[PDB]
Amino acid sequence: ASHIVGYPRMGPKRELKFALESFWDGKSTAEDLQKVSADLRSSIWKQMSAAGTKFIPSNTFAHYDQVLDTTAMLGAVPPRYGYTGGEIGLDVYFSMARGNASVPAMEMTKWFDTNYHYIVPELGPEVNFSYASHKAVNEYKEAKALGVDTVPVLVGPVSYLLLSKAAKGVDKSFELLSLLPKILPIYKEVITELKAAGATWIQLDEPVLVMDLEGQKLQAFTGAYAELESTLSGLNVLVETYFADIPAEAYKTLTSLKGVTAFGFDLVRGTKTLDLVKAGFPEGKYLFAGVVDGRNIWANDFAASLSTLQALEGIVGKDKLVVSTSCSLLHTAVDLINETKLDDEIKSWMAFAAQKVVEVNALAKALAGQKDEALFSANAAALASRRSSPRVTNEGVQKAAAALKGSDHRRATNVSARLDAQQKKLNLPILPTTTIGSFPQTVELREDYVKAIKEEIKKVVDLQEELDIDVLVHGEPERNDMVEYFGEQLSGFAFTANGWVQSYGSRCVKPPVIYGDVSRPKAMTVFWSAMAQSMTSRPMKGMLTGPVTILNWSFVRNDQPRHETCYQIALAIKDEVEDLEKGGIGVIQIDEAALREGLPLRKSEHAFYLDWAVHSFRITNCGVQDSTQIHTHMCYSHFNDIIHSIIDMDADVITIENSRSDEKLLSVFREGVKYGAGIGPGVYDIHSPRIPSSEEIADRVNKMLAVLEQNILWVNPDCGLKTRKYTEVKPALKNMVDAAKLIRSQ
Numbered sequence: 001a002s003h004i005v006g007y008p009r010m011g012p013k014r015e016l017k018f019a020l021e022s023f024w025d026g027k028s029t030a031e032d033l034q035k036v037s038a039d040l041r042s043s044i045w046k047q048m049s050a051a052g053t054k055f056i057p058s059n060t061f062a063h064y065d066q067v068l069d070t071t072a073m074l075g076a077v078p079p080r081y082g083y084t085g086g087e088i089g090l091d092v093y094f095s096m097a098r099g100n101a102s103v104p105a106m107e108m109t110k111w112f113d114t115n116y117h118y119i120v121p122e123l124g125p126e127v128n129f130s131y132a133s134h135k136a137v138n139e140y141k142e143a144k145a146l147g148v149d150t151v152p153v154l155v156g157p158v159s160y161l162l163l164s165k166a167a168k169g170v171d172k173s174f175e176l177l178s179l180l181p182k183i184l185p186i187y188k189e190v191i192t193e194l195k196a197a198g199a200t201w202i203q204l205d206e207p208v209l210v211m212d213l214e215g216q217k218l219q220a221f222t223g224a225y226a227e228l229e230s231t232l233s234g235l236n237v238l239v240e241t242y243f244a245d246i247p248a249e250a251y252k253t254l255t256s257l258k259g260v261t262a263f264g265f266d267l268v269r270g271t272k273t274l275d276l277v278k279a280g281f282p283e284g285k286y287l288f289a290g291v292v293d294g295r296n297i298w299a300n301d302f303a304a305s306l307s308t309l310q311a312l313e314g315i316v317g318k319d320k321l322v323v324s325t326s327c328s329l330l331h332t333a334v335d336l337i338n339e340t341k342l343d344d345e346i347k348s349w350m351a352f353a354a355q356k357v358v359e360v361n362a363l364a365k366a367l368a369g370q371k372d373e374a375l376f377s378a379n380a381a382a383l384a385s386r387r388s389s390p391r392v393t394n395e396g397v398q399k400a401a402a403a404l405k406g407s408d409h410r411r412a413t414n415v416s417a418r419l420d421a422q423q424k425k426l427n428l429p430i431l432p433t434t435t436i437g438s439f440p441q442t443v444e445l446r447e448d449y450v451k452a453i454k455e456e457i458k459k460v461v462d463l464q465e466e467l468d469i470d471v472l473v474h475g476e477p478e479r480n481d482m483v484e485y486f487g488e489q490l491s492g493f494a495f496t497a498n499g500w501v502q503s504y505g506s507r508c509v510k511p512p513v514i515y516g517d518v519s520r521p522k523a524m525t526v527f528w529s530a531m532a533q534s535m536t537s538r539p540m541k542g543m544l545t546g547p548v549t550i551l552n553w554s555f556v557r558n559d560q561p562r563h564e565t566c567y568q569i570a571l572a573i574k575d576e577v578e579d580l581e582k583g584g585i586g587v588i589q590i591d592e593a594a595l596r597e598g599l600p601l602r603k604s605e606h607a608f609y610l611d612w613a614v615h616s617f618r619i620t621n622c623g624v625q626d627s628t629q630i631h632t633h634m635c636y637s638h639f640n641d642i643i644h645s646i647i648d649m650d651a652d653v654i655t656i657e658n659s660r661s662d663e664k665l666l667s668v669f670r671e672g673v674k675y676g677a678g679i680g681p682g683v684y685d686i687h688s689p690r691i692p693s694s695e696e697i698a699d700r701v702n703k704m705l706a707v708l709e710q711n712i713l714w715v716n717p718d719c720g721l722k723t724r725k726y727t728e729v730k731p732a733l734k735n736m737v738d739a740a741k742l743i744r745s746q
């Protein structure tokens with residue numbers, strides 16, 4: 001038997017994205033959206049069915065988010081939406097998902113360690129739960145009619161609570177898990193209709209079990225399933241798990257849950273769990289082996305997988321071993337078939353969701369004795385060509401092996417003394433001003449060199465007249481994407497044509513692919529930066545994306561450790577920095593927008609990650625002169641549990657997010673830490689179209705100075721200005737400078 005934990009819902013050509021966007025804009029009706037939604041589900045179901053898949057998921061589809069889906073199922077909609085009961089529909093749902101003309105939307109946050117984001121439930125003692133959404137039972141019946149029996153998928157009740165947050169005005173004493181008695185009854189009613197409709201298997205996703213849970217919390221699972229047992233009667237129940245291995249204790253709780261007959265394990269990212277399985281697996285329960293990675297873009301290693309599956313068969317296998325994916329295919333691309341530019345060889349190394357369903361099935365048939373010798377042979381050949389291709393391996397291995405030469409701190413020179421030499425070259429005033437990089441993109445089109453120059457001189461001429469601004473940027477008018485801009489000029493990269501992944505709601509991202517050893521063949525930024533730094537006598541800063549960010553926002557190769565790859569990236573950037581230095585650029589900015597995105601779920605695995613992440617960053621400029629000032633930008637406003645790592649980065653100046661945060665929190669730097677380097681906490685929210693005033697900005701800078709030393713404090717925005725309009729940035733920036741200049745006089 002074969003199984004799939006979940007499936008992408010945007011469609012092979014992002015059909016749902018445009019349908020949702022058409023509907024949201026009012027250019028299509030509710031029915032039109034439903035028609036696109038139903039056809040998409042029918043297509044997905046029949047696709048998996050024709051493939052031989054036995055456990056086909058239903059309810060994986062979502063108009064916006066799976067968690068928001070369960071929120072509608074529990075009728076837990078926030079007070080401000082003025083919902084008054086009854087079956088929840090598009091209105092209320094999208095209203096929670098994106099807000100409306102008079103009410104803000106619910107918060108959205110990162111789903112475990114993926115690049116997907118869910119809507120966070122706002123729970124409290126005052127919420128009156130109710131079965132307000134029959135999405136699951138409907139989908140089950142819909143698929144039934146189409147002729148494909150499915151396995152309904154629900155976010156487990158206790159994972160749902162642990163993923164929520166207390167609503168405003170809810171005492172801190174309150175404990176979410178205290179709501180179980182209120183939501184469990186609803187799960188009962190949903191499971192009852194599912195059984196009545198004919199479902200014989202049901203899937204409960206309890207991914208929180210892969211987290212580090214205290215004994216008290218694990219106990220909550222136990223009680224929940226004990227309370228659900230009688231309802232789960234006469235039904236096979238699969239509790240799913242993914243993204244990491246299951247903690248020893250968590251494994252005891254899980255393998256002894258009442259009513260549960262099957263267990264889903266991520267064996268790509270949580271292979272460690274195998275140890276516990278070998279130590280002891282329940283009597284006659286099913287084990288769903290997620291051996292096909294649904295988190296990446298590579299073709300599966302059939303040989304290896306079979307070897308693993310067969311061993312598990314020994315542990316149970318008497319028809320109790322089901323081949324599955326490591327996690328929902330939601331986190332991978334839809335169909336490789338639609339990649340028509342990538343050469344056949346690189347494609348042979350790949351596999352998207354559609355191909356992964358075939359893989360799970362090929363493995364399942366192979367285990368049943370009906371091995372398709374033609375599939376395994378083609379796979380063996382592909383894996384071989386990849387493992388021997390020169391495109392993959394390069395003498396970058398030479399440079400790579402050397403970084404073992406201990407750390408890579410910039411030539412001793414403490415940052416404080418280093419700052420002195422830089423100030424010698426940059427006669428900057430107190431509280432200097434500068435921006436983060438990009439500027440509003442004007443007209444633009446699809447020679448070109450000259451067309452780009454004009455736009456820069458305009459940003460430079462603007463920056464100069466514009467409140468002066470002590471340190472200038474070029475606006476990045478020649479860049480379309482932070483990462484792709486550099487990936488297109490690096491070695492081990494390849495770019496997909498239609499491999500989109502859902503990021504959240506309707507927004508998708510098409511991650512670059514790093515298939516082999518990376519190296520920078522030619523200069524990438526020196527031309528444009530040198531050109532910008534000539535149109536002004538003011539300091540022009542260089543613009544590069546850290547190696548960590550490039551790594552995190554790419555489908556990274558799975559044939560070597562991530563850090564190993566991250567260093568190859570660092571090495572290549574290392575050149576550009578030193579090329580910008582020889583070019584004359586005396587100030588170089590390296591933004592690590594996604595420094596924290598690769599944080600492991602296992603808490604004890606954190607330190608290791610932060611280590612190579614930061615190292616990678618240092619490697620980037622460890623060989624720069626002491627007069628060369630280096631800036632690092634980071635899209636975050638909470639560093640309390642990662643502060644020491646920011647320090648070990650050893651940047652001359654760092655700019656973070658701040659302007660919606662309580663300035664008093666900046667004491668995290670000057671306390672038991674003593675930073676002693678440049679720091680520029682945002683003072684202008686670039687995500688809002690409103691213009692802050694010199695009064696407000698100046699006010700924030702003073703409250704800020706209340707904690708930080710005026711001699712290392714910079715004045716700049718929250719982030720780039722790409723998404724803003726010149727009509728909002730111009731007056732905004734002018735206020736920022738007036739505030740500074742003023743504070744300067746005082």
Ligand code: MET
Pocket residue numbers: 436437438482543591593633635719720721722
């Ligand atoms: C998202 S981090 C900032 C990237 C780039 N320097 C900008 O200003 O947009």
Ligand SMILES: [Zn+2]
Pocket residue numbers: 593633634635636718719720
């Ligand atoms: Zn940013």
Ligand SMILES: [Zn+2]
Pocket residue numbers: 644648
């Ligand atoms: Zn340290």
